[PDB]
């Protein structure tokens, strides 16, 4: 049995659908990795911070929860090869003609509080000359985009892609900014190398046979 903890709501990586079933890129990858390795998988969804605590306490064996691989984290955890590398970009409504970071001068651009997107906006404000608006969550940010109160909304490519798949009035006309590291499956350092290796090997098999790209496409991720 393999106990994996994750976040409680991070679409399109892990989230509950209309039937309350847990779905998402992380969920689907983990489930297929488990089947390939013949593991009995037990997922839990307490929240990212709680997941880390449970992993450190040995209450679960690993984590998959959009977890960025960083050198600092490698002091505490061992990671798989990244299984997805996210990126930031500016979402606009479908009727907008904005497509260049150098066309943001004097415009308002949104981001969610506490995110890499918000930090990028702070760090690049003097460079590009927009004003910044901060939102509590995605529903609020995208509503402000649809109302014209912001001209663009900085968020993750996979998140915008999924919202587009749901039929929301969104486009991605700008270039992307890669988020370094990528997301990784994590275990405690020096522990459970079996799981990391099994994850890596299954992921390679999934890439080769097309199952990996099928998962991404299911949640609207292309390119």
From TrEMBL:
GO CC annotation terms, alphabetical: ATP-binding cassette (ABC) transporter complex
Q: Does the keyword Lipid biosynthesis apply?
A: no
Q: What biological-process GO terms show up in the record? A: peptide transport; protein transport
Q: What coarse category fits the chief subcellular location reported for this protein? A: membrane
Q: Please state where this protein is localized.
A: Cell membrane
Tell me the keywords, alphabetical order: Cell membrane, Membrane, Peptide transport, Protein transport, Signal, Transmembrane, Transmembrane helix, Transport
- Coiled-coil intervals in this record? none
For this chain, one GO molecular function annotation is: ligand-gated monoatomic ion channel activity
Q: Which domain of life is it from?
A: Bacteria
Q: What family is it from?
A: Belongs to the bacterial solute-binding protein 3 family. Belongs to the binding-protein-dependent transport system permease family.
Q: What is this protein called?
A: Glutamine ABC transporter permease and substrate binding protein protein
Identify the coding gene.
glnP
Covered residues, full protein = 29 to 251 of 714
